[PDB]
């Protein structure tokens, strides 16, 4: 019993977890880390990334 409250809690936790883990996507860039882009490229031709 109490499946409805349980899966509401599970849905909220899963949404937060996938929002956290969606930070590892390149989105068509050279890397998913801002530090690598800021460390390997200058002020120009890094704004696109």
Partner 1 sequence: ETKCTLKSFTVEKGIYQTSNFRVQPTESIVRFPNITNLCPFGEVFNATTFASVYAWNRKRISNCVADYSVLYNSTSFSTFKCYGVSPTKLNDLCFTNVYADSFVVRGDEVRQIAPGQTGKIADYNYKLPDDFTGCVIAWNSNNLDSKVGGNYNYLYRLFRKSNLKPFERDISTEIYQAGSTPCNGVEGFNCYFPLQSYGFHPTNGVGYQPYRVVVLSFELLNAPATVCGPKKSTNLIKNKCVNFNFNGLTGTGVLTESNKKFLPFQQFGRDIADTTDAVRDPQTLEILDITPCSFGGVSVITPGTNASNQVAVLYQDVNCTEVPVAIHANQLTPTWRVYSTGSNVFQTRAGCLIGAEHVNNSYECDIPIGAGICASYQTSQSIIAYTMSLGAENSVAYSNNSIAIPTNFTISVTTEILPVSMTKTSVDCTMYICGD
Interface with its own copies by CB under 8 A: which residues?
A: 18, 21-22, 25-28, 47-48
Residue 6 interacts, among partner 1, its own copies, none and using kind-specific CB cut-offs from 5 to 8 Å, with none
User: What is the contact mask toward partner 1 in residues 1 to 40, using x (rule: CB under 8 A)?
Assistant: xx-xx--xx--x---x---xx-xx-------xxxxx-xxx
Distance from C-alpha of 26 to C-alpha of 37, rounded to nearest angstrom: 11
Residue 10 interacts, among partner 1, its own copies, none and using kind-specific CB cut-offs from 5 to 8 Å, with none
Cα–Cα distances in angstroms (integers) from residue 15 to residues 2, 3, 7, 22, 24, in the given order = 20, 18, 12, 11, 16
Q: What is the CA radius of gyration of the chain?
A: 18
């Amino acid at each position: 019993a109490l499946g409805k409250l349980q899966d509401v809690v599970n849905q909220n936790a899963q949404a937060l977890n996938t929002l956290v883990k969606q930070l590892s996507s390149n989105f068509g860039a050279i890397s998913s880390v801002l530090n690598d882009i800021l460390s390997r490229l200058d002020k120009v031709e890094a704004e696109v990334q």
